[PDB]
Symmetry: C2
Amino acid sequence: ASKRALVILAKGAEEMETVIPVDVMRRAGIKVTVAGLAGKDPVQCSRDVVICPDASLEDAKKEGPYDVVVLPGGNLGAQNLSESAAVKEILKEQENRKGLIAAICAGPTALLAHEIGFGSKVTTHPLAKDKMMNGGHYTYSENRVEKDGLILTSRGPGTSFEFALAIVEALNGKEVAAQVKAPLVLK
Amino acid sequence: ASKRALVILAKGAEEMETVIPVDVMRRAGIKVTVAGLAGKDPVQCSRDVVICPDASLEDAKKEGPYDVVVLPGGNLGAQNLSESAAVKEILKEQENRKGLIAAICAGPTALLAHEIGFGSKVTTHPLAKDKMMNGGHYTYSENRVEKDGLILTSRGPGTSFEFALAIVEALNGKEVAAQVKAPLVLK
């Protein structure tokens, strides 16, 4: 079987947190769709790297369901994800069907904005903790990667590989994750 | 002073090895130019991530000199860099002016193709070692990041942050590198 992943790309997204998971998941044989929040046009990321999405979020959502919905970080990117009604719908449906939801660095704050996974233990970038914890709807963790059921979170660009490999393990198992990890030269 | 970096992007380049250094260098205040080898059109990377270069290599080379020329990996990308006469010229001029040259994973094999930095200690991805060592023109290292004078090399996607931070330290110093590293959440 071939798992499917939806990565939602918005203006201001952290490019490393977008590309590392996309790349690693594809190395794991996961069919990944990089969906542009604003449409099919190129997206200017946080450090000006411009990525051309595979399709618009509008079209991509029509090709669901996905085994995992991935939310990259980047403050401005996360804010755009948090303000999107389309994102809210996708996350609510994914949660309802018991599908994996993964967010990294500032990305988890989008879960808060859409009231997703309340009651879960989560982590975020240290600078995004206060925002994420507003209201005490989650229990905070300092672990590099935190997985509480179907809510998988991570802390920053530097934890992107661990984050991606955790997604791979959840979808394709520990063996596949180990096989994909080796050639990456991660110590 | 504001250092300048030239990142040469070719079809088949490893997107993580392209984006991590670009992102990290920009966080370090380095003026980075993502130059498309084939032109100004979007580049399809090794794991299908499509990046739109800031400019064509042709135009970018006219805005030199650069404090560092960066060669991402990815077998097909490295091969394209190795076959480019334009790349050969840029690297030879950078070497001649005693400018830093950085290559990662499969990227160093391009140095071999253009006879750059012979006699230097270098590292590459384990799978690129035999190609790099053809003729014994370099001395091989297993270090995650190897720097011998103006030739800086690294092993793979998983060493991209160390590689990028080494470039930052060489250009802007140890203090700046430490400041940029902290928010990345690298352990």
